[PDB]
Design a protein around this ligand. Structure first.
Ligand SMILES: CC(=O)N1CCc2c(c(N3CCCc4cc(-c5cnn(C)c5)c(C(F)F)cc43)nn2C2CCOCC2)C1
Length: 114
């Protein structure tokens, strides 16, 4: 099956908005990590493929996903980066785990619909 860009935007953007709606848990993920601003200069030594909500939103808006699993892969890349980099006790790690729970719930019926 071939997916049209607007078909993917209509189906998948509500699942991304559900992540943005999470406060405080989406706040670390709304913009690309800025290591110098945050004072964490080792970040890019650990995380080789950064990803965040704003970049996913732009990719959906500009038709960069041909198939829904590419979108799912980027959302999970964002999660995996945060579980890799941050300590298990940290806000960003526990907030990431919450976003993963919300995403799992939202994406499943959408994928069934296609
Ligand atoms: C996604 C990822 O891996 N980041 C790398 C580490 C990281 C990120 C962030 N970010 C990115 C910028 C926005 C932001 C906002 C919040 C927030 C929540 N509730 N409120 C009211 C605000 C939090 C959360 F912590 F309070 C973290 C971050 N900080 N950190 C480290 C946090 C500890 O000091 C060093 C920086 C993003």
């Amino acid at each position: 099956k071939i997916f049209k860009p607007e078909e993917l935007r209509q189906a998948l953007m509500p699942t991304l908005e559900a992540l943005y709606r999470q406060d405080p848990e989406s706040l670390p993920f709304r913009q690309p990590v800025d290591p110098q601003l945050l004072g964490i200069p080792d970040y890019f030594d650990i995380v080789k493929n950064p990803m965040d909500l704003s970049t996913i939103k732009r990719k959906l808006d500009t038709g960069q996903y041909q198939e829904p699993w590419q979108y799912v892969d980027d959302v999970w890349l964002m999660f995996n980066n945060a579980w890799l980099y941050n300590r298990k006790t940290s806000r960003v790690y526990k907030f990431c785990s919450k976003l993963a729970e919300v995403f799992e719930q939202e994406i499943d019926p959408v994928m069934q619909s296609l």
